[PDB]
Amino acid sequence: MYYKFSSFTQKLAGAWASEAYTPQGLKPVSTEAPPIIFATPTKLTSSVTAYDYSGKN
Amino acid sequence: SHTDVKVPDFSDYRRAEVLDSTKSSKESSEARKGFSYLVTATTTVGVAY
Amino acid sequence: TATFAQALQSVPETQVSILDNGLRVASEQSSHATCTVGVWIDAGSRYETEKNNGAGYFLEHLAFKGTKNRPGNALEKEVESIGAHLNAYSTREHTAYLIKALSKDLPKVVELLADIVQNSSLEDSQIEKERDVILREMQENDASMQNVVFDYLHATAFQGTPLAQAVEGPSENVRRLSRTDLTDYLNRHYKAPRMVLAAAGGVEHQQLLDLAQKHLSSVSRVYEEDAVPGLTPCRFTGSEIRHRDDALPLAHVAIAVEGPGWANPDNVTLQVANAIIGHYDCTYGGGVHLSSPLASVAVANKLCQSFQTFNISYSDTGLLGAHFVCDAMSIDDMVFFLQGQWMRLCTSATESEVTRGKNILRNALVSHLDGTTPVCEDIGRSLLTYGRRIPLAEWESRIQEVDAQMLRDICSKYFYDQCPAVAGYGPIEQLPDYNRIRSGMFWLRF
Amino acid sequence: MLSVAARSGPFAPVLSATSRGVAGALRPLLQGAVPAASEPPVLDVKRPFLCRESLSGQAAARPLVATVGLNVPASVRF
Amino acid sequence: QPQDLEFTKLPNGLVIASLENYAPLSRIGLFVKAGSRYEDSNNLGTSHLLRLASSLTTKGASSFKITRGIEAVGGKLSVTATRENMAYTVEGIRSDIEILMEFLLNVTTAPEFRRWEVAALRSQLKIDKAVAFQNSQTRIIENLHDVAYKNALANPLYCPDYRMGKITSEELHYFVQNHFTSARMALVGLGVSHSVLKQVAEQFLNMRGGLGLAGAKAKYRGGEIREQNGDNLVHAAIVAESAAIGNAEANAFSVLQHLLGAGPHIKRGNNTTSLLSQSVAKGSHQPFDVSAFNASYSDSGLFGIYTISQAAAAGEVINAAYNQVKAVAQGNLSSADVQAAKNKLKAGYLMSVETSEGFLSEIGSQALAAGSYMPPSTVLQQIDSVADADVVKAAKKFVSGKKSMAASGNLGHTPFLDEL
Amino acid sequence: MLSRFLGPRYRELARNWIPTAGMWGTVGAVGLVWATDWRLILDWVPYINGKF
Helix, strand or coil: CCEEEECCCCEEEECCHHHHCCCCCCCCCCCCCCCCCCCCCCCCCCCCCCCCCCCCC | CHHHCCCCCCCCCCCHHHCCCCCCCCCCHHHHHHHHHHHHHHHHHHHHC | CCCHHHHHHCCCCCEEEECCCCCEEEEEECCCCEEEEEEEECCCHHHCCCCCCCHHHHHHHHCCCCCCCCCCHHHHHHHCCCCCEEEEEECCCCEEEEEEEECCCHHHHHHHHHHHHHCCCCCHHHHHHHHHHHHHHHHHHCCCHHHHHHHHHHHHHCCCCCCCCCCCCCHHHHHCCCCHHHHHHHHHHCCHHHEEEEEEECCCHHHHHHHHHHCCCCCCCCCCCCCCCCCCCCCCCCCEEEEECCCCCCEEEEEEEECCCCCCCHHHHHHHHHHHHCCEECCCCCHHHCCCHHHHHHHHCCCEEEEEEEEEEECCEEEEEEEEEECHHHHHHHHHHHHHHHHHHHHCCCHHHHHHHHHHHHHHHHHHCCCHHHHHHHHHHHHHHCCCCCCHHHHHHHHHCCCHHHHHHHHHHHCCCCCCEEEEEECCCCCCCHHHHHHHCCCCCC | CCCHHHHCCCCHHHHCEEEEEECCCCCCCCCCCCCCCCCCCCCCCCCCCCCCCCCCCCCCCCCCEEECCCCCCCEEEC | CCCCCEEEECCCCCEEEEECCCCCEEEEEEEECCCHHHCCCCCCCHHHHHHHCCCCCECCECHHHHHHHHHHCCCEEEEEECCCCEEEEEEEEHHHHHHHHHHHHHHHHCECCCHHHHHHHHHHHHHHHHHHCCCCHHHHHHHHHHHHEEECCCCCCCCCCCCCCCCCHHHHHHHHHHHCCHHHEEEEEECCCHHHHHHHHHHHCCCCCCCCCCCCCCEECCEEEEEECCCCEEEEEEEEEECCCCCHHHHHHHHHHHHHCCCCCECCCCCCCCHHHHHHHHHCCCCCEEEEEEEECCCCEEEEEEEEEECCCHHHHHHHHHHHHHHHHHCCCCHHHHHHHHHHHHHHHHHHCCCHHHHHHHHHHHHHHCCCCCCHHHHHHHHHCCCHHHHHHHHHHHHCCCEEEEEEECCCCCCCHHHC | CCHHHCCHHHHHHHHHHHHHHHHHHHHHHHHHHHHHCCHHHHCCCCCCCCCC
């Protein structure tokens, strides 16, 4: 009704009563979340062990 | 939703200086474009000769 | 009479006090009969570990659905007993629960906020209902292409880091969302030293400090594992995401580069750069006489429906660029013109454009801070980001230090010869290839 | 409480229209854009009726009947 | 503490008001009683193009000079319009107020109104009407005003599609010379002293002196309008006539709309204290929202209910809301809910005069209507001096009066006015 | 008829474009010296004193 955190400025701007305080739609139910299909999923791994120093014993 | 749209890993394609997702960029970026423009520069020297 | 600097000097100072818990209690007093009192918490979607991605958003949903002290809608009735407005938001880095009210009800509203801080009852039927509501509003937010492009830009600009994930999280995380992980998130991310209680308007700092010592005493003060949660830096990635769907009438394209962050002062200079380019949409009434060259070219050649420029900052990182909606048949040309303007600011920034951008930045900085609510937001985000409320006189002193030489130096530092992040949505066939955009990010004539 | 637009609470920007000739420093919420919509077809102009004799017969007196032919032009009767 | 607001009634009828806020930025606006109330059927859409002609060429300042001069100093020029009055407001740094007032008064007193400029501007007004009709509340309130009034308030905010390409410069000049006269001007300024405003008003705005062309006198006709456009939601607005502005019955109707539900208070709230939301929520199980509409002008007002519901359940929502208002009109209300509605109304007005632009809008409106300023404490005392019998009488006036219903959506299950 | 190009903004633009134009003139001079093998210049460069 008064302010909504938006407009790409990281700030509150002026917004309507139906947009700042009712951000959900008036649809009865949520419809669907369709999946994403792909050729072949890539591998994910990290590497942060590194090594140590060298010397006697 | 559009929040399901997720970029897969490129770790089998990235350079060695940007493999870590924890350290920041913009420290080794100038070295990377220095290497690439050095390759471009020596090619242009050769074709100019 | 008074000048601008004297008028900015006459603005009252924000009083800041501390608690034994670590709470930051800050207040700005004006002569208004209303006030805005809010709680800002340093816990966004950046603090999640990819298995609790929608946790803070779902807490924002359940925060107003009853507590242990006030079970259910009676809490809501209390906010409607005094005619108060109860608002909240969640970002990728901050969470805020704020109430606009009068001043005479200034005690109880603080107590109400304290309830939402630390006694949020999480009933399982409320979990299922808010799960349905979250799915409904994500499928509603899919319609707004601007938010989709914003999330695409964040996903492709910070890949593999906790800054790529959305505030609301994926749908599957909403489906399998339990209560134990919400309790864990509330325990480990709602602690006292990461909280600012900010008040703006007809308030007294001593009364607000007494109310925070009464109600907001002993919030957590304990990490519960002796493990302080921190924020690692997020790697910027020059990349490109293109969502092609030709059935949409218009295309939205955002191009960004890596920003400096919050504490790096050249932000202010970069604001002037945005003030040179500005914003435009079709409802404006300037015609071909607009001061911005991009806006004048877009009006004259009928290129874009709208464009805007953004400088979004997070903890030692950020995005800096432009976002435009236009038809398909102009997209490439718009990109060209936009890139030209950036290189103009890298090469030939003149003094008159710098003075106009400084005036626009002064107007924006003061005109934003009207009313109690944006002042309270400024106080909370200033104590969370900079650690202090930066006064408007210091903003005026920082603006006055900018000439054209340091502006083109900063623009050459951040814009020139850099890899951008491109997010497109719609009929984006004529959106140029990434090699063309990366070539357009520098000039052969310099 | 005067200022009718501010007196009506939720219907403040519905009862009043605000535009600008010079853009502000603050960027407006919901910038908005006209989608490329369709266009009406172009038809040849019809005869005006600026005398009383030409208006004779132009008034409807029967239920309206449409007719679509294949190689006959589509007609309508009043 | 800033200085008090101070007024001056000039001999040409102009009312100037100034408050020295010592603000970093000053906002200065001129309020003119020249809305769409004053258009007859032969000049429809003239106020819309006059609203969009705030940057055309004037004497002493061209379009290039106006745009490049306001845009260089960082300030802005905007114009707002209800159905009864317009407001041209500039704002900017206090070191720029001289050229800002020069630009504002040159725009609002003597526009040249050249032919090629309005020929360029008509496509812009078409685009403006399209953007404004992208939502659903604007079209249904526009049709509600079309059917609620038979004259002088059925003229819309936006130019009709048949008039596009037909407004000439001559009728713009005619509208300006009739309705931009000095007896109906309120020049208000926040952040500027009374000496500067007084000297500019006496030096520049002695061009017109008359009262101007008035005498609209809107009348009520009632009825209904249906817009089958196939949306899955159904919007409905059912109103009736009500008292004008500046009366105790207007305060009674404001207390009545804040009792029945006058907008949300909590983000994604359940609307616990709204009576209409209570009745529909105890009756239905679908997403909806029901609010109370009140638009009280200087001679007449419209009060009613506004529902957005499903297509298959619009009838039960509208019937539940109407039966709730009928229950309120019979006397089924408690004093605690009336006290809560009074507190909500007081807080709503005080939040409405919070920011500088809403405060300046209030200053200009009260300066136009009354010539002076009532302090907000007197307005709160006038709110507090309303009995619940006045609320019952206002609800009884709404129920027992003829109605105006505007409906949009899939109206197969939407009831007509005879079935309510 | 170039009196349009007299002003402080054009002077600042030209002042910004002096060093880039000077560097491009240096590139053109070095390119014309190298591609023509001018004896007035390569006899002064210490390394290239072998072909003359």
